[PDB]
Amino acid sequence: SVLQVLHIPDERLRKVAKPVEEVNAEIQRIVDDMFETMYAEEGIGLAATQVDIHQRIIVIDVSENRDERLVLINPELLEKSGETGIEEGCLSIPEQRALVPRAEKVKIRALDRDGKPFELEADGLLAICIQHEMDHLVGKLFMDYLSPLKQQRIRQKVEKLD
Ligand code: NI
Ligand SMILES: [S]
Question: Of 92, 85, 99, nearest to 155 (Cα)?
Fold first, then answer.
């Protein structure tokens, strides 16, 4: 099933996800529906918060083939270093891109789509992407990293579209 993706201004994008309790069949339907939604919208990552489910679930695909499935349930940043940043975009902030500061390298743990934990050391577009998506789970969007000015210009340009 494809899910609607919430757009700013929506208070539901500001909600703080509670952790996933038991990884099960029902949690697995959410996952595949998020993958379906993420590809359908040609996005490289998605957080349950954006589809208005408020649990700590994240699906990602940073491959250029669009065939490498990565799932982060209840993720937890253990280490990080450096700074990086690229032009980021967001399915929930339609057609707005800006550069945002990020840690270069991240090291997270999380449970996978079967409920089994894994540790992951990341850099490049994955590190940027893990950070961007975990921000969604705690009510934070990437435009928050910018002067109030650019933040108003961004909401204005998103009013019009929708
Ligand atoms: Ni986003
Ligand atoms: S996103």
Answer: 92
